[PDB]
Amino acid sequence: MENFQKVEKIGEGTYGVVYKARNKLTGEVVALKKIPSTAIREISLLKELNHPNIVKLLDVIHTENKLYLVFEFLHQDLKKFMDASALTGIPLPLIKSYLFQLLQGLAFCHSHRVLHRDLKPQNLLINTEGAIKLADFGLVTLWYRAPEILLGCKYYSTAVDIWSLGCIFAEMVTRRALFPGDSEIDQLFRIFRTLGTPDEVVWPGVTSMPDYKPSFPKWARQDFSKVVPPLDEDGRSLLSQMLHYDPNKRISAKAALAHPFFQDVTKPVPHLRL
Numbered sequence: 001m002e003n004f005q006k007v008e009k010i011g012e013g014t015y016g017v018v019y020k021a022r023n024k025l026t027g028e029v030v031a032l033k034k035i036p037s038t039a040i041r042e043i044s045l046l047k048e049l050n051h052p053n054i055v056k057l058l059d060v061i062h063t064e065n066k067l068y069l070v071f072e073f074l075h076q077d078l079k080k081f082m083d084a085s086a087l088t089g090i091p092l093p094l095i096k097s098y099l100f101q102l103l104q105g106l107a108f109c110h111s112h113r114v115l116h117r118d119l120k121p122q123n124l125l126i127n128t129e130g131a132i133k134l135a136d137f138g139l140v141t142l143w144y145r146a147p148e149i150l151l152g153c154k155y156y157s158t159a160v161d162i163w164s165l166g167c168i169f170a171e172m173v174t175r176r177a178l179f180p181g182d183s184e185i186d187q188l189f190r191i192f193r194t195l196g197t198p199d200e201v202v203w204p205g206v207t208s209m210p211d212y213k214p215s216f217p218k219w220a221r222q223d224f225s226k227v228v229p230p231l232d233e234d235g236r237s238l239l240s241q242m243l244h245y246d247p248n249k250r251i252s253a254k255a256a257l258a259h260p261f262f263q264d265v266t267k268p269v270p271h272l273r274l
């Protein structure tokens, strides 16, 4: 630990604060996160989870009741990049490359029985080479929370990550959060108001979910062409499948990678102001 120089606070992760540091010895620039014995094994399983689209966990330093996670340093996160392009908009070719990379990253996690659980623009990091990576794997914002989680599902699947990514995809396209809920019920009702209140017809077993209530107002599904205009039909087709109420009907990361939408995917480079 005495081997690091805090450079500046580059944010506050969900489980602790994150700083930019200079390895006092090797001089390398990294990201330090100031954070049970089960979670110590837990996060050591992460050290082996390496992929081009997953922020590298360089090291773990457990010391005097303080847990420190050393990560590879990426200057910008997606939330900050979306604000900076909020007037012009991220070019579609770039939106497509990012989604593709993230789906590749998710596909890798999910094939290893690892879920993210808390995907959001803030935990997605980008670099000048046009790459995007997943950061902050869960072990206050509900905008990207899948409906089965909101309805009390304790043993939810990897599909929750597809839901969250579908929400981020739609946000990159419209430059407005899809379902900006301010409460558990506001979030759920915002989803219901747009995709229609779920029932036994579209989601078998929903009415048996822990927090489901027959008293939920019954809204109808809205025109989907009104949800993410002016996204093309290939993209709208893919988003609709990522936003399916039924977690087992929801498109998988691997399968998503085979959708015609990525037929012309490329790897353009952003224009960051670091």
Ligand SMILES: NC1=NC(=O)C(C2CCNC(=O)C3=NC(Br)=C[C@H]32)=N1
Pocket: 010, 011, 012, 013, 014, 018, 030, 031, 033, 055, 071, 072, 073, 074, 075, 076, 077, 122, 123, 125, 135, 136
């Ligand atoms: N919420 C977050 N949980 C995290 O672990 C991070 C990191 C760590 C990965 N490496 C970096 O360089 C980072 N840059 C920025 Br910005 C944030 C982060 N954020």
